[PDB]
Amino acid sequence: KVFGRCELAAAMKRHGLDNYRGYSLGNWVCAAKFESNFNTQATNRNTDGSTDYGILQINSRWWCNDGRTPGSRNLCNIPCSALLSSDITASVNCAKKIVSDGNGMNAWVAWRNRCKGTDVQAWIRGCRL
């Protein structure tokens, strides 16, 4: 499913991401736009052989099991395929674990390079929330 901007903001708000660990909703919407273009089906291979999955591009090297990333962890205790669902619950719940691990949203490269230090509230402008 390809979300609209305001539709995704509303879904993330209901799943508790607004101001989670101090990150306002626009940060999460901005990260999703540049990680996946709001597409829950997005996948992308990494040089080390791991793969990133879903709307927030969660990496099989640490967070989910895809059966083909040797020596990797599964810290969210989920198959990576669950992160491609049109229901974002699993991606949100795993993202809460990632953002709480000490490095905040710097774990998402696109957030650090394209969202951090910008007017991220623009990403929720106009939306009925």
Q: By rule CB under 5 A, what string of x and - marks binding of each residue 8-37 to Cl ion? A: ---x--------------------------
Task: Give Cβ neighbours of residue 20 (< 8 Å, ≥ 6 apart).
Answer: 96, 99
Q: Which of 104, 112, 114, 127 binds Cl ion (CB under 5 A)?
A: 104
Centre a 10 Å sphere on the Cβ of residue 121 and count the other Cβ atoms it contains: 13
Report CA dihedral (33, 38, 41, 46) to the nearest 10 degrees.
0
Q: Binding to Cl ion by residue 101, rule CB under 5 A?
A: no
Q: By rule CB under 5 A, what string of x and - marks binding of each residue 51-90 to Cl ion? A: ------------------------------------xx--
